[PDB]
Write an enzyme that holds these catalytic residues in place. Structure first.
Site, short mmCIF file in Angstrom:
data_model
loop_
_atom_site.label_atom_id
_atom_site.label_comp_id
_atom_site.label_asym_id
_atom_site.label_seq_id
_atom_site.Cartn_x
_atom_site.Cartn_y
_atom_site.Cartn_z
N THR A 151 4.08 -7.57 3.74
CA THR A 151 3.52 -8.10 2.50
C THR A 151 4.46 -9.13 1.86
O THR A 151 4.03 -9.95 1.05
CB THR A 151 3.20 -6.97 1.46
OG1 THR A 151 4.41 -6.58 0.81
CG2 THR A 151 2.63 -5.75 2.13
N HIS A 160 -7.02 -17.20 10.67
CA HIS A 160 -6.65 -18.04 9.55
C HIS A 160 -6.62 -19.50 10.01
O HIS A 160 -6.05 -19.81 11.06
CB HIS A 160 -5.29 -17.63 9.02
CG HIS A 160 -4.97 -18.21 7.67
ND1 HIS A 160 -5.37 -17.61 6.50
CD2 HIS A 160 -4.31 -19.33 7.32
CE1 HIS A 160 -4.95 -18.34 5.48
NE2 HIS A 160 -4.31 -19.39 5.95
N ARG A 220 -12.77 -17.73 5.16
CA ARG A 220 -11.82 -17.91 6.24
C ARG A 220 -12.50 -17.95 7.61
O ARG A 220 -12.12 -18.74 8.48
CB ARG A 220 -10.79 -16.79 6.23
CG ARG A 220 -9.89 -16.74 5.00
CD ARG A 220 -8.68 -15.85 5.33
NE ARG A 220 -7.83 -15.53 4.19
CZ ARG A 220 -7.15 -16.42 3.48
NH1 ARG A 220 -7.24 -17.71 3.78
NH2 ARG A 220 -6.39 -16.04 2.47
N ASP A 260 0.79 0.70 14.75
CA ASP A 260 1.26 2.05 15.02
C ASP A 260 0.44 3.15 14.33
O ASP A 260 0.32 4.25 14.87
CB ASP A 260 2.73 2.15 14.63
CG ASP A 260 3.59 1.13 15.36
OD1 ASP A 260 4.81 1.03 15.08
OD2 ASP A 260 3.03 0.41 16.21
N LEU A 298 2.46 -18.99 8.81
CA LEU A 298 1.41 -19.34 7.86
C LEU A 298 1.80 -20.25 6.70
O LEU A 298 2.93 -20.25 6.21
CB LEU A 298 0.78 -18.08 7.29
CG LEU A 298 -0.24 -18.31 6.17
CD1 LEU A 298 -1.33 -19.20 6.68
CD2 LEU A 298 -0.83 -17.01 5.69
N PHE A 349 -9.49 -20.18 -5.17
CA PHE A 349 -9.29 -19.70 -3.81
C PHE A 349 -10.60 -19.55 -3.04
O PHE A 349 -11.67 -19.47 -3.63
CB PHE A 349 -8.56 -18.35 -3.83
CG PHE A 349 -7.39 -18.28 -2.89
CD1 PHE A 349 -6.93 -17.06 -2.41
CD2 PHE A 349 -6.74 -19.43 -2.49
CE1 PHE A 349 -5.83 -16.99 -1.56
CE2 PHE A 349 -5.64 -19.37 -1.64
CZ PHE A 349 -5.19 -18.14 -1.17
N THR A 373 0.05 -20.74 3.22
CA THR A 373 -0.94 -20.21 2.29
C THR A 373 -2.22 -21.03 2.15
O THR A 373 -2.20 -22.26 2.24
CB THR A 373 -0.32 -20.00 0.88
OG1 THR A 373 -1.32 -19.52 -0.03
CG2 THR A 373 0.27 -21.31 0.36
N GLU A 374 -3.35 -20.34 1.96
CA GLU A 374 -4.63 -21.00 1.76
C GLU A 374 -4.60 -21.56 0.34
O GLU A 374 -5.45 -22.36 -0.06
CB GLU A 374 -5.79 -20.00 1.89
CG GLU A 374 -7.13 -20.54 1.39
CD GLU A 374 -8.28 -19.58 1.62
OE1 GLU A 374 -8.64 -19.35 2.79
OE2 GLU A 374 -8.83 -19.05 0.62
N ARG A 391 -12.64 -10.85 5.36
CA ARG A 391 -11.84 -10.73 4.15
C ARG A 391 -11.80 -12.00 3.31
O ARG A 391 -11.53 -13.09 3.81
CB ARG A 391 -10.41 -10.30 4.51
CG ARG A 391 -9.40 -10.46 3.37
CD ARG A 391 -8.02 -9.94 3.74
NE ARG A 391 -6.98 -10.57 2.94
CZ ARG A 391 -6.64 -11.86 3.06
NH1 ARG A 391 -7.26 -12.63 3.94
NH2 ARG A 391 -5.69 -12.37 2.29
N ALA A 446 -6.97 -13.49 -0.85
CA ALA A 446 -6.36 -12.91 -2.05
C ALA A 446 -6.93 -11.53 -2.41
O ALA A 446 -6.71 -11.01 -3.51
CB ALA A 446 -6.51 -13.86 -3.24
N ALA A 478 0.80 -1.21 0.00
CA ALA A 478 0.00 0.00 0.00
C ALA A 478 0.84 1.27 0.00
O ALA A 478 0.68 2.15 -0.87
CB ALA A 478 -0.93 0.00 1.20
N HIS A 492 -4.74 -13.59 12.00
CA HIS A 492 -4.11 -13.39 10.71
C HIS A 492 -4.27 -12.00 10.08
O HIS A 492 -3.29 -11.32 9.81
CB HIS A 492 -4.66 -14.44 9.75
CG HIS A 492 -4.10 -14.37 8.37
ND1 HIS A 492 -2.78 -14.66 8.08
CD2 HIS A 492 -4.68 -14.08 7.18
CE1 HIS A 492 -2.59 -14.56 6.78
NE2 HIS A 492 -3.72 -14.22 6.21
N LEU A 534 -3.96 -8.15 -1.01
CA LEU A 534 -2.89 -7.63 -1.86
C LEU A 534 -3.53 -6.72 -2.90
O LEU A 534 -2.95 -5.70 -3.30
CB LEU A 534 -2.11 -8.75 -2.53
CG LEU A 534 -1.15 -9.58 -1.67
CD1 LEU A 534 -0.32 -10.51 -2.58
CD2 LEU A 534 -0.21 -8.65 -0.89
N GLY A 573 -0.34 -16.53 -1.10
CA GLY A 573 -1.49 -16.81 -1.95
C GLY A 573 -1.49 -16.20 -3.34
O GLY A 573 -1.16 -16.86 -4.32
N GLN A 626 -9.67 -11.50 11.76
CA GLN A 626 -9.71 -12.73 11.00
C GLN A 626 -8.77 -13.82 11.49
O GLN A 626 -7.57 -13.61 11.62
CB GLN A 626 -9.41 -12.46 9.53
CG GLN A 626 -9.33 -13.73 8.72
CD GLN A 626 -9.28 -13.49 7.24
OE1 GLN A 626 -8.22 -13.16 6.68
NE2 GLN A 626 -10.43 -13.64 6.58
#
Ligand SMILES: *Cc1cc2c(cc1C)nc1c(=O)[nH]c(=O)nc-1n2C[C@H](O)[C@H](O)[C@H](O)COP(=O)(O)OP(=O)(O)OC[C@H]1O[C@@H](n2cnc3c(N)ncnc32)[C@H](O)[C@@H]1O
Ligand SMILES: C/C=C/CC/C=C/CC/C=C/CCCCCCC(=O)OC[C@H](COP(=O)(O)OCCN)OC(=O)CCCCCCC/C=C/C/C=C/CCC
Ligand SMILES: C/C=C/CC/C=C/CC/C=C/CCCCCCC(=O)OC[C@H](COP(=O)(O)OCCN)OC(=O)CCCCCCC/C=C/C/C=C/CCC
Ligand code: HEM
Ligand SMILES: COC1=C(OC)C(=O)C(CC=C(C)C)=C(C)C1=O
Ligand code: SF4
Ligand code: F3S
Ligand code: FES
Lengths: 102, 138, 613, 239
Positions: free
Chosen positions: C49, C245, C289, C224, C255, C122, C257-258, C400, C403, C21, C356, C406, C54, C243
């Site tokens: 990130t 996971h 999720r 922060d 983690l 997914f 990945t899903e 959420r 995928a 972001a 997560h 991102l 995923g 969320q």
């Protein structure tokens, strides 16, 4: 632009394979010819070799410039001294031979 | 700010400071490859020194090669010494020679893997010994 | 104070955070011709990130025919209708262009035989509005898409004149009469203080999973940015919806990945049942999720664990071709082995639902502008934007869709830059600043710097994490929740009895980790409180007291003869939370969720329906 | 009870006259994680929180850990502690680098070097970017495997003797490999100019094929093998 660095790199490999084919060649066929090309490759290869050690360890415009200069000298007196020996003497080949059966 | 200015800033900041350089050769773990890399230089250096000494001597010192040889023949030359000295000369030359071949192969881009690396190192080391003892008796 | 000299920088725009972001916001602002500054406490590439595996969603239609509108539908539904549909419209419609932009930047996406970006299945994504079957629009770079996304964006940023303040800790926003003037930060290298002022500020500081004990997030995910907004007296939205996971190694919480499930892997309980087929027939192992974890978490209760204490489960990939796990999930094979010691090609990985993602964050507009609530209405906070996980444009709502984060990163990162480029010009007047702006921040800094208390920063943080872990996990109830609130409000009290040891000016991770604690606390207070007050079950927030989806109407049966409940009588609304920095008193309100899209003709609103996969 | 000994390098910039020295710490391995970073975090939270070091993902993909553990550069969060209580673990900062404080090195030159190779896609015609996805066969794509996974931890470069002596002008393994990453990307149109940038005696040619870089990559990548590919390209490209 010019590809000086890359060409020098290849140059080194070339005389590296050349000096590799000479050692055997000089055994199977000792002769004044072999003694000269063997002196050419032997000194060149060594000149470029110490060159790399110099650019690697000598830090500073002052020093490297000098170092490179003194290296060139040593190489010159080395190739000449070898040619002298091949002319006014036995020749590296026969010298090795002689030196061995001793 | 550019890549170059960033580099300039880096040096101006560190050289002018009480920041210490973390240790390196004193702490890094020695490996066969790293060791064999050092020897290649050392031998190349020693080998060049020898060749230069042979050529310069040929220009400054008096007498022919024979005047020099006979000069050594009459020097009580112990057989278990003529062979020693003969080996010491063949050793660095052979080592540098075989390792050099290895170096060339690498330039072709072959054998550059940890596994392949150790194998060739051992080989190069074995060939060295063989060709040395071999030549010291030719 | 004044023991810390302050340096004053002046720019057009400032971006706090260099994750997906932030990075996209920063170079996008420069690309637009603005003198942009980017403040990050980490080297851009270390951002979280990078851990993303995923992929990034986009209806490119590379695998089959697709329609971004189906992506829209899937997303609003996955939000359990707490998602603002206008933002979800913007995000899914822009996704294709955003993903192609990444590929054109050089992102090394995995390819198809046609030479196009390879996409994959997914969690809960269908065709023809939930009717056409499982969709395949999850674009990806093998199994390291996050890592590659961050690196290519970073690389692309080197191409511009953005001034990147590396390893700088943002302390607070420079606010003046309800308008943002920039940020004040601590340069970790020499301990000096910098007041970077600008006409616009963009907050993209990531989430705050570290408020918990077990999470998939990095040690640096300390909320922060949320804390700054909170310290300014601004609201934070939906902080309760956390969320969980499904797949997270019993150990460190890392983690897997899903994408493993989307690629073929399955989930198995102790008895060996593919339970994710009992709790959700159609979607099965590949459902939302929030539901999929609520499942497992449950199975552990019945007493069906898969290891020593029967506290976790078992993720399977074994039956998949060894090569496929090599071309599609190479990243999980490594860590699965390194942290678990497993050969995925011949053994299932040990996973357990762990914290997560954070759907809540700084209240946003679909244009990235931060919102405050006045007289029950939204109001744009001049010169302040937010994007990424730290933001709550709420395209994720109560849950959420995998995928989609991102995508969110890249889409709104761009939106912020665009709203600034469209609303002003570089070189415009940069607002004044009182010569004492930030004084409070520095003082608070100087305080913790020499803290001679009785409690160690690590001790306190540990108290907060385990409390959150026990009182605000996958399942909750008033009792467990209230004890948690007072339990956490109690720890907040202790922030004054904390002890610090390091006292130098250079790299005081002692000082900063403490500053981070102050931040994690403000986030926990809002999470647990907003959680206790929400008496219903939507998305990730599942209450035992109220297993109901309290909407304005009862969308199960018809709607017409039925009567609409008053706004303050239902829970289909966003939670807005505040807190008195000095006492830790949480006050909260609510605002409607936006149901209208940007254009009825181009993308129709999807009314609330029943939640099920 | 299983006590493990930890010898760790230290240096406080804000402590007049302080000089680099090792401080030993003891830890009950039963009350700790399996990785070296776990130990660091532990002595950080209980014994001495003045111990400074970079960390974040503790998963081995961010590259924040880079440091020398028992003579080898790796990632503290992936290198499991030696359970041999008889041995005492030695933790040092990455080799031949300026220490900012304790285990934290100045990687500014390293990053700057990375910027100099222009690590991004360059097309001759950028007028159409952003509208269509560029095509790349899975064949052309496979050539990137083993190159793009670089985490930029700096373990490799910081293990190279050539980088130790000429890190100011020699780009090092890490950067060289990313330059190669860009050289062979079918979508990039500046291969020739990327090679030309290395036409001097330092950037690339200080590499003498020592191979420590490859022998230490926490990610099992092969910088050296890549440096050699560049060298071949350098001696055979035209113009
Ligand atoms: C944890 C996680 C999340 C994740 C994932 C795998 C893991 C292990 N895989 C995903 C996937 O495959 N697909 C997807 O759609 N999402 C996935 N996620 C979730 C997603 O990655 C995250 O939500 C997203 O990456 C967050 O991005 P964002 O840009 O918002 O944030 P960040 O990368 O975490 O970076 C934070 C930045 O802010 C700076 N920062 C933070 N605090 C400060 C302060 N105080 N001062 C200055 N700068 C600050 C950081 O330094 C950083 O640059
Ligand atoms: C340069 C200065 C060289 C002097 C320094 C020292 C000696 C060099 C060590 C090389 C040992 C070579 C082996 C001996 C050898 O083959 O001689 C016997 C053979 C005769 O027996 P034969 O078997 O009866 O005859 C051969 C069959 N035709 O010898 C020959 O006639 C072939 C000699 C070819 C020698 C190769 C040149 C090597 C370069 C030396 C390098 C530098 C470091 C110092
Ligand atoms: C007592 C008697 C009184 C009078 C005697 C006079 C003094 C001569 C000393 C001059 C040294 C000049 C140094 C200039 C230099 O570095 O040239 C480069 C060149 C190499 O070309 P290059 O093209 O830079 O390098 C070639 C390497 N292949 O360097 C040299 O030629 C060094 C020569 C040194 C000789 C000793
Ligand atoms: C048998 C024949 C030889 C072969 C195949 C050979 C090969 C090589 C190769 C491949 C290198 C480059 C190593 C690198 O990449 O750093 C090298 C370097 C060198 N060689 Fe040789 N060599 C031979 C004989 C000699 C001899 C007889 C001498 C002595 C005069 C010598 C002196 C050197 C020196 C000084 C270097 C520089 C090493 C460095 O970069 O530090 N070589 N050789
Ligand atoms: C040939 O490459 C090498 C060097 O030159 C760059 C070294 O100085 C060294 C270092 C030796 C001393 C301990 C400083 C090694 C090990 C090496 O492999
Ligand atoms: S190649 Fe390997 S060591 Fe060198 S930075 Fe990239 S990850 Fe690290
Ligand atoms: S250690 Fe270096 S010297 Fe070459 S191979 Fe790896 S870059
Ligand atoms: S902390 Fe991220 S790699 Fe070790």
């Amino acid at each position: 632009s010019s590809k000086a660095a890359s060409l020098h790199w290849t140059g080194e490999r070339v005389v590296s394979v050349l000096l590799l084919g000479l050692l055997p060649a000089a055994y199977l066929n000792p002769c004044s010819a072999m003694d000269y090309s063997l002196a050419a490759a032997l000194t060149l290869h060594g000149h470029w070799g110490i060159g790399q050690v110099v650019t690697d360890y000598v830090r500073g415009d002052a020093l490297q410039k000098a170092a490179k200069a003194g290296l060139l000298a040593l190489s010159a007196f080395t190739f000449a001294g070898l040619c002298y020996f091949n002319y006014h003497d036995v020749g590296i080949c026969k010298a090795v031979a002689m030196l061995w059966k001793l | 700010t550019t890549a170059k200015e960033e580099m300039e800033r880096f040096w101006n900041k560190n050289l002018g400071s009480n920041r210490p350089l973390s240790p390196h050769i004193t702490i890094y773990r020695w490996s066969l490859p790293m060791a064999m890399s050092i020897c290649h230089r050392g031998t190349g250096i020693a080998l060049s020194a020898g060749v230069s000494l042979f050529g310069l001597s040929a220009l400054l010192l008096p007498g022919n090669f024979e005047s020099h040889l006979e000069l050594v023949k009459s020097l009580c030359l112990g057989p278990t010494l003529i062979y020693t000295a003969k080996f010491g000369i063949v050793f660095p030359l052979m080592y540098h020679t075989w390792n050099g071949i290895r170096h060339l192969i690498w330039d072709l881009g072959k054998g550059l893997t940890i596994p392949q690396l150790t194998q060739s190192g051992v080989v190069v080391l074995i060939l060295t010994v063989l060709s040395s003892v071999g030549l010291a008796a030719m | 104070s004044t023991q810390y000299p302050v340096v004053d920088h002046e720019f057009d725009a400032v971006v706090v955070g260099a994750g997906g972001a932030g990075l996209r916001a920063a170079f996008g602002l420069s690309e637009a011709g603005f003198n942009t500054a980017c403040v990050t406490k980490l080297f851009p590439t270390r951002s979280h990130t990078v851990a993303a595996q995923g992929g990034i969603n986009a209806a490119l239609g590379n695998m089959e025919e697709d329609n971004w509108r189906w992506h829209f539908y899937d997303t609003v539904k996955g939000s359990d209708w707490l998602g603002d549909q206008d933002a979800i419209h913007y995000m899914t419609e822009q996704a294709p262009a955003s993903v192609v932009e990444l590929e054109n930047y050089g992102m090394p996406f995995s390819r198809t035989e046609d030479g196009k970006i390879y996409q994959r299945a997914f969690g809960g994504q269908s065709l023809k509005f939930g009717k056409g079957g499982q969709a395949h629009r999850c674009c990806c770079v093998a199994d390291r898409t996050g890592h590659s996304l961050l690196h290519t964006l970073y690389g692309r940023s080197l191409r511009y004149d953005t001034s990147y303040f590396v390893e700088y800790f943002a302390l607070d926003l420079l606010m003046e009469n309800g308008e943002c003037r920039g940020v004040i930060a601590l340069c970790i290298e020499d301990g000096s203080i910098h007041r970077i002022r600008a006409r616009n500020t963009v907050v993209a500081t990531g989430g705050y999973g570290r408020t918990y004990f077990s999470c998939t997030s990095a040690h640096t995910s300390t909320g922060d940015g949320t804390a700054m907004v909170t310290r300014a007296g601004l609201p934070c939205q939906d902080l309760e919806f956390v969320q969980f996971h499904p797949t997270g190694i019993y150990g460190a919480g890392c983690l897997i990945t899903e994408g493993c499930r989307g690629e073929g892997g399955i989930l198995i309980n102790s008895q060996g049942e593919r339970f994710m087929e009992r709790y959700a027939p159609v979607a099965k192992d590949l459902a939302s999720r929030d539901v999929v974890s609520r499942s497992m978490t449950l199975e552990i209760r019945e007493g069906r664990g898969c290891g020593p204490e029967k506290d976790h489960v078992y993720l399977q990939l074994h039956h998949l071709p060894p090569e496929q796990l090599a071309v599609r999930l190479p990243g999980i094979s490594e860590t699965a082995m390194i942290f678990a010691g497993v050969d995925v090609t011949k053994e299932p990985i040990p996973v357990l639902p762990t914290v997560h993602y954070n759907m809540g964050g700084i209240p946003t507009n679909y244009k990235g502008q931060v919102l405050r609530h006045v007289n029950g209405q939204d109001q744009v906070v001049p010169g302040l934007y937010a994007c990424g996980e730290a933001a709550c444009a709420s395209v994720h709502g109560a849950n959420r869709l995998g995928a989609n984060s991102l995508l969110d990163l890249v889409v709104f990162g761009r939106a912020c830059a665009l709203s600034i480029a469209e609303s002003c010009r570089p070189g415009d007047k940069v607002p004044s600043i009182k010569p004492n702006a930030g004084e409070e921040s520095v003082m608070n800094l100087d305080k913790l710097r020499f803290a001679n208390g009785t409690i160690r920063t690590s001790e306190l943080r540990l108290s907060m994490q385990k409390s959150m872990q026990s009182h605000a996990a996958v399942f909750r109830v008033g009792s467990v929740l209230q004890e948690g609130c007072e339990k956490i409000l109690r720890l907040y009290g202790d922030l004054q009895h904390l002890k610090t040891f390091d006292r130098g000016m250079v790299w005081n991770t002692d000082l900063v980790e403490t500053l981070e604690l102050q931040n994690l606390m403000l986030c926990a207070l809002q999470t647990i409180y907003g959680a206790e007050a929400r008496k219903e079950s939507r998305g990730a927030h599942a209450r035992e007291d109220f297993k109901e989806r309290v909407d304005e109407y009862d969308y199960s049966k018809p709607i017409q003869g039925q009567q609409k409940k008053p706004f303050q009588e239902h829970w289909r609304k966003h939670t807005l939370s505040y807190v008195d920095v000095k006492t830790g008193k949480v006050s909260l309100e609510y605002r409607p969720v936006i149901d209208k899209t940007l254009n009825e003709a181009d993308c129709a609103t999807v009314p609330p329906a029943i939640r099920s996969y | 009870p299983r006590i493990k000994k930890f010898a760790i390098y230290r240096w406080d910039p804000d402590k007049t006259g302080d000089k680099p020295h090792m401080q030993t710490y003891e830890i009950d391995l039963n009350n700790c994680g399996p990785m070296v970073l776990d130990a660091l975090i532990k002595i950080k939270n209980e014994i001495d929180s003045t111990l400074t070091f970079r960390r974040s993902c503790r998963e081995g993909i961010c590259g924040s850990c880079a440091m020398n553990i028992n003579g080898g550069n790796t990632l503290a969060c992936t290198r499991r502690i030696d359970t041999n209580l008889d041995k005492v673990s030695k933790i040092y900062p990455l080799p031949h680098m300026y220490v900012i404080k304790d285990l934290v090195p100045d990687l500014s030159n390293f990053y700057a070097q990375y910027k100099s190779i222009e690590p991004y896609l360059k097309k001759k015609d950028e007028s159409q970017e952003g509208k269509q996805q560029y095509l790349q066969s899975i064949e052309e794509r496979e050539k990137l495997d083993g190159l793009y996974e670089c985490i930029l931890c700096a373990c490799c470069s910081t293990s190279c003797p050539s980088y130790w002596w000429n890190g100011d002008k020699y780009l090092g393994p890490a950067v060289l490999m990313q330059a190669y990453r860009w050289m062979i990307d079918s979508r990039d149109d500046f291969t020739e100019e990327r090679l030309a940038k290395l036409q001097d005696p330092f950037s690339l040619y200080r590499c003498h094929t020592i191979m420590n870089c490859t022998g230490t990559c926490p990610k099992g990548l092969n910088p050296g093998k890549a440096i050699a590919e560049i060298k071949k390209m350098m001696a055979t490209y035209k113009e």
